[PDB]
Design a protein around this ligand. Structure first.
Ligand SMILES: N#Cc1ccc(O)cc1F
Length: 283
């Protein structure tokens, strides 16, 4: 079926939970043996969210190459993404090592450091220009260059220096700051505006390594971001945009990382975002 009318048909019939459970039943199951080794317990935020072995990002280190991060490669859309958990106190250096090694231009953050009164990820970037951060375990230095605070999101320019080679690179930090503590946003308008700002920066384009996207677990809000982006790109590329099937795209993405889209409300919100976004691309 088309999307917008499949949408109204699920709303009128109140069957979002049944649709979402079908997706969960059909999703791929692949091994995640490296994630579950005992030496990696303090590298995982949640015991039930792990990268598959076949798609995990490897750190260029001979001691321990593990990080909770997955490469999502979308062949028809010609887009790639790295989805990862919010960094932990003992993985902030690994996080920036990955950004460096994979040649990423942008980092997309969809959570606040504290939500619901608890810490959802480490304070992994510097908050003042004159107070830089040094990660001694991976030999990297990170400096805040500028910050632009808007009503729904903040954009930061950062400098990452590889202290071994003295090479430097500019990284863009796109921080969506207004996702509610419970539920999903009422309108997709500010999320779409944010997606378009990431696109306009070059961070999603083939001349750079894959964008790094995270929330707390790296599957829920993060899944919504890449699902919406890929669906809108396919609608631009194809002769028949109504042929784009969001449930099929989500199942393809779940071949590369488990659990993408965590609730039926997040599924409905993804439909809403793609529907409204398709009108702005042209309406
Ligand atoms: N990209 C892409 C893509 C194309 C067709 C499909 O059924 C699912 C997909 F993710």
């Amino acid at each position: 079926m088309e999307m917008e009318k499949e949408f109204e048909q699920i709303d009128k019939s109140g069957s979002w939970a049944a649709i979402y459970q079908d997706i969960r039943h059909e999703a791929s199951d692949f091994p995640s043996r490296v994630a579950k080794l005992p030496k990696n317990k303090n590298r995982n935020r949640y015991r039930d969210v792990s990268p598959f072995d076949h798609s995990r990002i490897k750190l260029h280190q001979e001691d321990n190459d593990y990080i909770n991060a997955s490469l999502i490669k979308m062949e028809e859309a010609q887009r790639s993404y790295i989805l990862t958990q919010g960094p932990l106190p003992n993985t902030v250096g690994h996080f920036w090592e990955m950004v460096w090694e994979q040649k990423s231009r942008g980092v997309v953050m969809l959570n606040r450091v504290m939500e619901k009164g608890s810490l959802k990820c480490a304070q992994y970037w510097p908050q003042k220009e004159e107070k830089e951060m040094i990660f001694e375990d991976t030999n990297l230095k990170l400096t805040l260059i500028s910050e632009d605070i808007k009503s729904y999101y903040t954009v930061r320019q950062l400098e990452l220096e590889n202290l071994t080679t003295q090479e430097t690179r500019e990284i863009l930090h796109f921080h969506y700051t207004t996702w509610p503590d419970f539920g999903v946003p009422e309108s997709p308008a500010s999320f779409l505006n944010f997606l378009f700002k990431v696109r306009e920066s070059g961070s999603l384009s083939p001349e750079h390594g894959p964008v790094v996207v995270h929330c707390s677990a790296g599957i829920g809000r993060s899944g919504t971001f890449c699902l919406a982006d890929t669906c809108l790109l396919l609608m631009d590329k194809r002769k028949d945009p109504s042929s784009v099937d969001i449930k099929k795209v989500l199942l393809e993405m779940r071949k590369f990382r488990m659990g993408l889209i965590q609730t039926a409300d997040q599924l409905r919100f993804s439909y809403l975002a793609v529907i409204e976004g398709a009108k702005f691309i042209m309406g």
